[PDB]
Design a protein around this ligand. Structure first.
Ligand SMILES: Nc1ncnc2c1ncn2[C@@H]1O[C@H](COP(=O)(O)OP(=O)(O)OP(=O)(O)O)[C@@H](O)[C@H]1O
Ligand SMILES: Nc1ncnc2c1ncn2[C@@H]1O[C@H](COP(=O)(O)OP(=O)(O)O)[C@@H](O)[C@H]1O
Ligand SMILES: Nc1ncnc2c1ncn2[C@@H]1O[C@H](COP(=O)(O)OP(=O)(O)O)[C@@H](O)[C@H]1O
Ligand SMILES: Nc1ncnc2c1ncn2[C@@H]1O[C@H](COP(=O)(O)OP(=O)(O)O)[C@@H](O)[C@H]1O
Lengths: 272, 143, 1488
């Protein structure tokens, strides 16, 4: 059947596209003490497991396509989902937009695995200290709220502060013109929909989306001072479907702006 | 059969659905309130079509919620204005309407905190004594 | 009757009948009051039991009626019930008035006196004092707003807030010091409400509200009390927003107060608006957000009882219908929990019901149709539906919605901390809540992990208890050292972060896996920085544990010492017992959970002086209806379940068990079917609710624990509702098990002392090998690396090794007994024990694997050990045995050389001894001496059933009972076997099940122990039951729910590999107790020996051929070899080969030879070829397979019989028949065709006239089928495309041989009972009549798998006991009696005539099964019912071949004349018929 031949073609194409393997992080007592290393090791293990599962499933599909392997119930269900264009349930272990088809999912998985491979290489080259200074895309991670919590824990442990007394400040600056302080963590890929951010100041704009060059998350002691009238709280959704709420950022609107207009127009930060 | 899109069409359907006698009661201001309610309802429903942007999910802001809001307005206006032909716009129980239509009606389906914030913004913009002036703007810089 | 006073309408028909019958027995009415009241569990009466003095709640708080209701004055049940309810409402209102006046005296006060406040709290109820505080605060705020109405004036409202503050202060001092638990709950509720009132008053102050009608005040829930109101019921009115509700005034007793967090307030507003608008509310949202609780709190605050149903997948309707109509008549609220879980049809039905009720409610804004009855719906009725993400389409317009997206955990804590009396509660809450978020996120995911709200709540309650205990300890120290006592001083100087850390650790560390323990500490270092805790050792408990471990022969240790981890786990179990009533010891089997809790119970008994009693209940083995209790659908009688029975026994306090410590251990797997009922017990309410409605209060001394190995299937609800203790397999190290075995061997004698001295000497000998990193440990580590047929469990291997060493000690004792002159000296004893130990590791660790891994283990142990070993160059130590002289002697010498009798060839009973036979006989002897159940696992056939049977019949005192387990096996089968062969007797220990035959060990052989199907939760009921009697030494009789101890009963099982289709792997917990021996197919040498013996015994009939016995057997084996190598099971599901085929071969050759007095070698080769074709060729599917088979048998015949003629011995027409000749001598195909054609003509004349063309395949088929009918118990599995003639030939053969054809007329309504009755008729028609029946079955006639199960049992036993019972069985008995009288056999008892009936059926009845060639369907049929593939012989009709089609065409188109002389032969003839004549005629061309 021609469907079998074209499924062979697309399976081979994806097996070429997806990276080969992922390297687990090396455990160490000092690394175990570090929370960022723990979070990144969990992410690496999850990514490696999912990558191995997907690669083995694609290899089994290819072997069936040659006729060398018979379609078991799991393999038959996978083939049916592939032909119908629906995302297999086994593959989807992280949160994914509902309408995303298989090809886009494979592309996203490839990008995430590339990011994880770079992260593992950087960690192996240095350690947790280098792991602190890695600019990581929140959308690329499987659980970005875990990353936010990990940064909070790292800042609390470095300065011997308590977790509940720390608050988050966002500094949106260019990647080249950025300062990596002790409490500052870089994040890329955030996109602002409904507004433009210049000099950490929000301005209303008609553009559909303005890409934030580099967002610096800084954990600071609770000043216990009321937020100014120009301070606006913007949600950070994981994808464009706006079903996942990672956290909330606080920005300073420009003068002559109205925060109610910001609320009405649905201005929000998106991970991807 | 589908409802014709358009704030004008939505308001016309809302006004046709409500009996004419109810909107014309002892307080002459009551009709004004109803109009505002209709407008607000229309706006809310017309933000459903832009689901990712206007809201976070396709809520069921159906006719039942509109009927509940009309009943709430009726009861609170009757309690505040006990058979008075005219009532001052300040004396209108604005806070009761805003709170009830932010938490009980139109807010029971709202689970996202930011959707609740948007609903509160809309209610505080529309339902106020300042609406009873001829300078009130139902919308700003439309075109 | 129920129409008047609808309040008792709540109960069903059962309780109505009971209250009508026992109306005068008021003491028996307490269950009804427990059912319908919320808090009232009993009514307080006098000694005369004639006047209702008051009411009493489950906690012990009671209310005395101002004017008691006299039952004598109103004999009618309804009249005095209504009087009691009215009295309770009026008295509650009067007490509310009194307490409101008292608290108003307390209100408006600069300071309050603690003694007066505590006295006021003690005087009234918790609900009443909370309501009085609410009323007083509401009135004070209303007065303040009335004063403020002027506007721009001074604010005494501050004072009101200050008032609350000051009284809050005294509360913060009341809970610090020790209080009675009831007053403690009262103080907790009062503190929670006072904190809420202070917060809302602060909000009012901030808002500067100065008008009483301002909506900011109107939103808050307000209470108004009007003494002036004539009706006490209407005195209290709860107004919030525009909604108004009259207070229920119904006694709630004491309930858990819910801190009113922002969300809960929003919920209150939304639900009150919905109820005012006369439609219910749906608080949809995720799990554990307050959805259900919030509804219950709203109902209780209005004085109403909410009935919270559970909408699980297994949901009852008639109970739901009765409970719902009861609520409708009562007017009490009803909440639905997780509506979406309901089945779509179930959902639609319940949605329609609630739609009708809601429509009635809106119409009331009055009776409605419910269960074909008129139900009066009170206006106060309300309905709530909690959902998890929508509402059904018919309900979307009838119900408001509300979002419980996220609970206010940060406040819930703060408020509960201030309730416990903690200072700096804000910081502690802001630390603890994110800490639990971290635990829920950062810790590795596990099935038993739980970090939800319920956890926070519990952890905080435990922290409050810990702080109170520490306060008491410091107070006692101050009493002993000095005299300055000041509770405030102790509280101020008391660290509180340390208390929270200690409580968190005591509650959560036990459930943490080995890897997650450090992370938690790091998490604490992140949340509670710089503050550390140190666990307080229990020195007295450690000493008691050491003594009990010494008494029980267990290893005890401290810290890093051996057994330290186990001791820490026992201490953690003790702490969880202290801080919880529901426990769960999770961990892989073999972690010591059972012994951990047993040792802890014994140590607690010996320490505290409170004797402990443990009830071990297996939930899965018993039925859930028998577990919790049965309510008869018609007689409505309630019989308490096992758990219900033991709980009622404990509550009754008959023999002081309330004094004792009762531990109910639910040993067994847990699934969300039975434990759902236990969810009402594991919560803080601690009550068991039965379907009859009767609720039993859980005594404080009772602890519920689930000794469950895995939690992959338990719901998160139960996980969150009980404490968890994790027992990793690393807890019980191997050294501990070795020490336990050695101590038990040294201490207890094996018989029940000389052999005790022998055991001590043996333990001294093997002590070097049992040390840490010894021979046994390294051998076990290597054995885990190999592959085994079943799952490897460390305790299984260790238990088998210990049993075999016990057998070694018994052998030493026997040798000493038989040699009184010379008992075995020390050197020979060391040699024997060392060699037997090596042999014991060899046969214990690798006793369940193939020979290659057995040899691998042998080589490894040879490399690593120092014990002397046999010097055989290639023979492994396994074929060697250890003699009583301590020497390595070959097993071959133990193998004799017997010559079977000629008439006994291939007989079922005879077993030819060989290497595998003797080795497995020795292993079976050993594992039967200790009565240890064992499992013989191996491929089909393989000599497993017979090898076991030979051993068991060799044993004299052990009778055998076989039980063919099927895919539908249930413990009722074991119960039937027990009541058939054993009997219950009352003994001083208790009731005991023992065989009716004295001094006999009944062995319940189970033919297929892994066949039974597992439930949807991975549990096999029969396997769990067998494990239960094996490990607990007994089971539970459900007729009276009593512990039955098994006496002289042991189990033995056999099974095919679990990897085979239709085979389920056994539980690890069960596999721990049963050693598995892998009986592989006998090797070529074993087959050669066994069947050379059979051939030599066979050929004694014809001496002139005797000398050919040796090669023939080889040939018979030789060909067979490549058969098992060529047609593997991968190609086809039925392509299996076993020594059973070879035995059938020998039997067939003997049957062919016995008639004939003399016969040359060519005739013998012809018989052998005929049998090879009839065994190894009909099963084949493809033509090339048959060609290969024929060529291979040809080659084998020439290889082993070279000096023979191929044309005569191996003539192509191999047709054997007894139709023409008297004897079974081969017949030419043509003469056979002529005879069967004449028989077909007679068939046409007599039976149905259908023309049948006689192609050569029909001859072969009519021969094989006739062969099968002639042999007793001849059963066929005909396979072929439909219409090929399977039934056509079956009917023909049955008519020819005299068998009456019987087919079952199957239709759509042909139920299982109809098939059962047809089977009964056939059984009557076969055995009772001595009339042979050809039973025609087609898979179309099969409408259910149960048909196949009954057929399986019939094939495997020649009968099915299930069909014939009671009057039917008596009719059968009469019939077989008449039949035996006619035939000439005089038998009286039922058993002998039943056996004669079974023999008659097995010799007469013949069942055939026709099927189409569905290979996947073939595999499913084989897996579902093994008997159709076990002994049923199956043929491959397939489809008519080209030759067959050609012959059909010619014979049928013989009448028409396609004889055309003008036909010319073409140059190219498209030949498709193989034997087409070289000139095609016109007719030949047309047929082609
Ligand atoms: N402290 C100990 N020292 C030495 N041996 C011990 C100790 N505790 C238990 N054992 C032994 O180890 C084995 C543990 O059996 P036990 O039934 O307690 O395990 P389990 O994990 O509860 O298994 P199951 O869940 O199947 O009941 C037994 O042979 C027991 O005698
Ligand atoms: N406002 C609250 N005050 C006190 N406890 C609460 C509150 N909200 C929720 N809880 C607790 O949280 C848990 C949620 O249980 P439940 O109400 O059954 O949740 P759900 O119905 O969402 O499954 C319970 O232990 C409940 O007592
Ligand atoms: N040592 C032996 N002596 C005699 N017959 C044997 C021996 N080993 C195997 N057989 C033959 O193999 C067959 C084994 O079948 P059986 O053990 O009943 O299968 P299962 O154990 O699966 O029920 C028997 O028919 C028997 O004739
Ligand atoms: N040897 C044969 N010659 C001619 N017709 C046959 C032969 N065997 C079967 N049939 C035909 O098959 C029909 C019955 O098929 P049946 O045996 O019921 O199919 P199944 O194989 O499903 O049992 C009869 O009508 C008969 O004509």
């Amino acid at each position: 059947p021609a469907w079998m031949r074209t499924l062979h073609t697309t399976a081979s194409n994806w097996l070429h596209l997806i990276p080969q393997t992922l390297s687990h992080l090396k455990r160490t007592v000092e690394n175990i003490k570090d929370p960022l290393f723990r979070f990144f090791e969990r992410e690496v293990k999850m990514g490696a497991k999912l990558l191995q599962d997907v690669r083995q499933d694609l290899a089994d599909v290819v072997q069936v396509c040659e006729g060398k392997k018979k379609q078991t119930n799991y393999l038959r269900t996978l083939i049916n989902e592939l032909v119908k264009g629906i995302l297999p349930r086994s593959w989807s272990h992280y949160t994914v937009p509902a309408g995303m088809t298989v090809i886009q999912w494979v592309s996203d998985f490839s990008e995430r695995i590339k990011q994880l491979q770079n992260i593992s290489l950087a960690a192996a080259s240095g350690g947790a200290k280098e792991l602190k200074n890695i600019h990581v895309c929140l959308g690329g991670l499987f659980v970005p709220e875990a990353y936010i919590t990990a940064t909070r824990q790292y800042v609390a442990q470095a300065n011997s502060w308590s977790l509940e007394e720390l608050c988050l400040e966002v500094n949106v600056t260019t990647s080249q013109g950025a300062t990596l302080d002790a409490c500052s963590f870089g994040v890329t890929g955030l996109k602002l929909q409904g507004a433009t951010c210049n000099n950490n100041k929000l301005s209303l704009s008609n553009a559909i989306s303005t890409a934030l060059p580099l967002t610096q998350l800084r954990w600071v002691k609770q000043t216990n001072t009321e937020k100014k009238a120009s301070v606006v709280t913007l949600p950070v959704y994981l994808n464009f479907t706006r079903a996942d709420l990672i956290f909330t950022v606080d920005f300073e609107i420009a003068t002559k702006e109205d925060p109610r207009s910001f609320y009405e127009r649905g201005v929000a930060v998106l991970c991807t | 059969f589908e409802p014709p899109p358009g704030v004008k069409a939505n308001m016309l359907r809302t006004f046709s659905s409500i009996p004419v006698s109810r909107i014309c009661k002892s307080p002459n201001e009551r009709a004004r309130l109803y109009f505002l309610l209709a407008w607000f309802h229309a706006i809310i429903q017309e933000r459903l079509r832009y689901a990712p942007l206007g809201w976070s999910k396709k809520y069921e802001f159906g006719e039942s919620d509109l009927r509940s809001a009309c009943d709430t307005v009726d009861t609170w206006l009757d309690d505040t204005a006990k058979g008075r032909q005219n009532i001052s716009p300040d004396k209108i129980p604005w806070s009761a309407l805003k709170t009830l239509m932010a938490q009980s009606i139109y807010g029971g389906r709202v689970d996202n905190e930011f959707d609740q914030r948007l609903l509160n913004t809309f209610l505080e913009r529309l339902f106020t004594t300042r609406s009873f002036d001829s300078e009130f703007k139902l919308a700003c810089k439309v075109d | 009757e129920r129409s008047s006073f609808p309040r008792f309408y709540f109960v069903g028909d059962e309780d109505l009948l009971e209250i009508i019958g026992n109306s005068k027995n008021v003491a028996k009415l307490q269950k009804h009051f427990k059912k319908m009241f919320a808090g009232v569990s009993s009514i307080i009466l006098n000694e005369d039991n004639s006047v209702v003095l008051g009411i009493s709640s489950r906690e012990g708080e009671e209310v005395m009626f101002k004017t008691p209701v006299s039952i004598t004055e109103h004999p009618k049940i309804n009249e005095w019930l209504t009087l009691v309810e009215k009295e309770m409402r009026v008295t509650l209102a009067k007490l509310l008035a009194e307490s409101v006046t008292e608290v108003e005296i307390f209100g408006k006060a600069t300071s309050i006196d603690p003694n007066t406040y505590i006295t006021w709290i003690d005087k009234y109820q918790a609900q009443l004092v909370v309501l009085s505080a609410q009323i007083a605060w509401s009135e004070n705020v209303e007065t303040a707003l009335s004063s403020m109405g002027g506007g721009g004036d001074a604010a005494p409202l501050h004072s009101v807030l200050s008032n609350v503050e000051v009284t809050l202060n005294v509360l913060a001092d009341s809970v610090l010091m020790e209080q009675p638990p009831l007053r403690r709950r009262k103080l907790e509720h009062l503190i929670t409400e006072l904190v809420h009132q202070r917060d809302v008053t602060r909000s009012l102050i901030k808002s500067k509200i100065d008008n009483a009608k301002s909506f900011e005040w109107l939103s808050q829930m307000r209470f108004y009390f009007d003494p002036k109101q004539t009706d006490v019921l209407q005195q209290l009115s709860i107004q919030m927003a525009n909604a108004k509700f009259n207070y229920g005034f119904e006694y709630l007793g004491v309930q858990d107060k819910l801190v009113q967090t922002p969300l809960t307030d929003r919920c209150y507003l939304t639900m009150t608006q919905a109820l005012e608008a006369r439609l219910g509310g749906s608080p949809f949202g995720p799990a554990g957000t307050g959805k259900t609780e919030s509804v219950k709190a709203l109902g209780h605050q209005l004085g109403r009882f909410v009935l919270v149903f559970n909408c699980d997948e297994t949901f009852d309707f008639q109970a739901m219908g009765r409970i719902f109509v009861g609520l409708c008549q009562v007017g009490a609220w009803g909440c639905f929990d997780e509506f979406n879980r309901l089945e779509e049809r179930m959902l639609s039905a319940v949605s329609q019901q609630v739609q009708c009720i809601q429509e009635a409610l809106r119409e009331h804004s009055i009776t409605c149709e419910l269960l074909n009855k008129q139900v009066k719906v009170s206006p106060d009725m309300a309905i709530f539906i909690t959902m998890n993400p929508n509402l059904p389409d018919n309900l979307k317009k009838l119900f408001r919605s509300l979002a419980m997206t996220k609970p206010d955990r940060q406040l819930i804590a703060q408020v509960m901390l201030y309730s416990q009396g903690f200072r700096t509660a804000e910081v502690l809450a802001n630390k603890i809540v994110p800490f639990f978020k971290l635990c829920d996120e950062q810790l590795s995911s596990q099935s038993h992990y739980d970090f939800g709200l319920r956890a926070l709540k519990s952890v905080l309650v435990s922290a409050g208890n810990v702080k109170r205990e520490r306060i008491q300890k410091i107070k006692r120290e101050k009493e002993e050292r000095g005299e300055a006592v000041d509770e405030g001083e102790i509280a101020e100087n008391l660290p509180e972060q340390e208390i929270l850390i200690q409580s968190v650790c005591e509650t959560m560390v036990p459930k943490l896996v080995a890897e997650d323990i450090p992370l938690l500490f790091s998490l604490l270092s992140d949340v509670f920085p710089g503050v550390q805790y140190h666990r307080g050792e229990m020195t007295a408990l450690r000493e008691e544990l050491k003594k009990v471990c010494q008494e029980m022969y267990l290893t005890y240790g401290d810290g890093e010492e051996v057994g330290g981890m186990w001791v820490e786990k026992v201490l953690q179990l003790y702490q969880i017992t202290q801080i919880n009533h529901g426990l769960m010891m999770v961990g892989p089997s073999g972690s010591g959970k059972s012994m951990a809790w047993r040792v802890l119970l014994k140590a607690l008994e010996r320490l505290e002086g409170v004797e402990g009693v443990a009830h071990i209940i297996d939930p899965k083995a018993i039925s859930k209806d028998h577990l919790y209790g049965t309510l008869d659908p018609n007689t409505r009688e309630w019989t308490d379940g096992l758990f219900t029975h033991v709980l009622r026994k404990i509550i009754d306090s008959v023999r002081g068990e309330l004094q004792k410590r009762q531990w109910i251990v639910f040993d067994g797997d847990v699934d969300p079917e039975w434990v759902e009922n236990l969810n009402s017990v594991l919560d803080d309410n601690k009550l068991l609710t039965l379907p009859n409605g009767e609720r039993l209060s859980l005594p404080p001394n009772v602890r519920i624990m689930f000794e469950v190995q895995d939690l992959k299937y338990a719901t998160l609800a139960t996980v969150s509702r009980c404490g968890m203790v994790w027992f990793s397999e690393d807890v019980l190290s191997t050294d501990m098990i070795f020490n336990n075995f050695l101590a038990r061997l040294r201490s207890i004698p094996l018989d029940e002392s000389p052999m005790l001295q022998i055991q001590r000497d043996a333990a001294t000998i093997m002590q070097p090998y049992f040390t840490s990193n010894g021979l046994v440990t390294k051998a076990l580590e290597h054995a885990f690396q190999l592959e085994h047929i079943m799952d490897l469990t460390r305790l299984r291997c260790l238990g088998s090794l210990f049993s075999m060493l016990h057998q070694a000690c018994r052998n030493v004792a026997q040798y000493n007994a038989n040699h009184p002159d010379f008992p075995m000296q020390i050197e020979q004893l060391e040699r024997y024990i060392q060699r037997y130990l090596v042999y014991a590791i060899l046969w214990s660790l690798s006793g369940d694997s193939r020979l290659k891994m057995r040899a691998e283990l042998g080589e490894y142990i040879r490399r690593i050990t120092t014990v002397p070993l046999p010097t055989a160059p290639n023979i492994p130590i396994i074929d060697y045995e250890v003699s009583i002289s301590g020497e390595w002697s070959p097993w071959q010498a133990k193998v004799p050389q017997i010559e079977v009798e000629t008439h006994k060839v291939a007989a079922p009973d005879v077993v030819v001894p060989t290497l595998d036979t003797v080795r497995h006989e020795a292993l079976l002897y050993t594992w039967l001496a200790e009565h240890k159940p064992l499992v013989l696992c191996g491929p089909p056939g393989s000599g497993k059933t017979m090898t076991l049977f030979s051993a068991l019949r060799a044993l004299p005192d052990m009778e055998v009972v076989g039980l063919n387990f099927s895919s539908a096996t249930t413990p009722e089968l074991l119960l039937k076997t027990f009541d058939h062969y054993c009997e219950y007797r009352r003994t001083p220990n208790g009731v005991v099940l023992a065989p009716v035959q004295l001094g006999k060990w009944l062995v319940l052989f189970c033919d297929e122990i892994n066949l039974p199907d597992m439930d949807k939760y991975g549990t096999q009921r029969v396997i769990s039951f067998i494990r239960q009697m094996v490990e607990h030494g007994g089971f539970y009789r459900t007729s009276d729910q009593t512990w039955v101890k098994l006496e002289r009963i042991q189990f033995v099982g056999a099974c095919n590999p679990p990897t085979d289709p239709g085979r389920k792997p056994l539980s690890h917990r069960f596999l721990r107790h049963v050693p598995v021996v892998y009986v592989d197919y006998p090797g070529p040498a074993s087959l050669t020996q066994i069947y050379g013996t059979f051939n030599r015994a066979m050929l004694r009939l014809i001496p002139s051929l005797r000398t050919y016995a040796e090669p023939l057997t080889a040939a018979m084996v030789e060909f067979y070899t490549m058969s098992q190598e060529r047609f593997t099971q991968d190609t086809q599901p039925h392509y299996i080969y076993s020594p059973r085929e070879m035995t059938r071969w020998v039997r067939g050759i003997f049957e062919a030879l016995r008639p004939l007095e003399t016969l040359p070698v060519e005739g013998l080769i012809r018989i052998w070829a005929h049998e090879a074709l009839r065994l190894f060729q009909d099963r084949l599917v493809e033509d090339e397979e048959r060609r290969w088979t024929d060529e291979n048998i040809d080659t084998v015949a020439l290889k082993h019989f070279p000096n023979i003629d191929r044309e005569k011995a191996m003539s192509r027409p191999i047709l054997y028949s007894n139709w023409l000749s008297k004897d079974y001598i081969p017949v030419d195909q043509e003469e056979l065709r002529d005879y069967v054609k004449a028989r077909l003509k007679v068939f046409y004349e007599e039976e149905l006239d259908v023309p049948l063309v006689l192609f050569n395949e029909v001859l072969d088929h009519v021969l094989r089928i006739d062969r099968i009918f002639r042999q007793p118990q001849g059963h066929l599995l005909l396979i072929g495309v439909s219409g090929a003639g399977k039934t056509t030939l079956s009917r023909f053969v049955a008519w020819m041989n005299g068998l009456s054809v019987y087919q079952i007329k199957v239709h759509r309504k042909y139920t299982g009972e109809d098939f059962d009755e047809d089977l009964r008729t056939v059984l009557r028609r076969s055995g009772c009549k001595n009339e042979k029946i050809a039973f025609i079955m087609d898979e179309s006639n099969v409408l259910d798998s149960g048909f196949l199960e009954r057929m399986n049992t019939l094939l495997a036993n020649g009968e099915v006991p299930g069909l014939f019972e009671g009057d039917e069985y008596a009719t059968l008995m009469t019939q077989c009696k008449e039949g035996a009288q006619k035939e000439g056999l005089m038998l009286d008892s039922h058993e002998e005539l039943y056996k004669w009936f079974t023999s008659q059926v097995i010799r007469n009845l013949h069942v055939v099964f026709t099927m189409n060639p569905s290979s996947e369907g073939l595999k499913d049929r084989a897996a579902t019912s093994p008997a159709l593939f076990n002994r049923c012989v199956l043929n491959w009709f397939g489809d008519w071949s080209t030759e067959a089609l050609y012959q059909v065409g010619k014979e049928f188109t013989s009448k028409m004349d396609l004889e055309k002389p003008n036909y010319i032969v073409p140059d190219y003839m498209p030949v498709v018929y193989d034997k087409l004549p070289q000139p095609p005629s016109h007719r030949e061309a047309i047929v082609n």
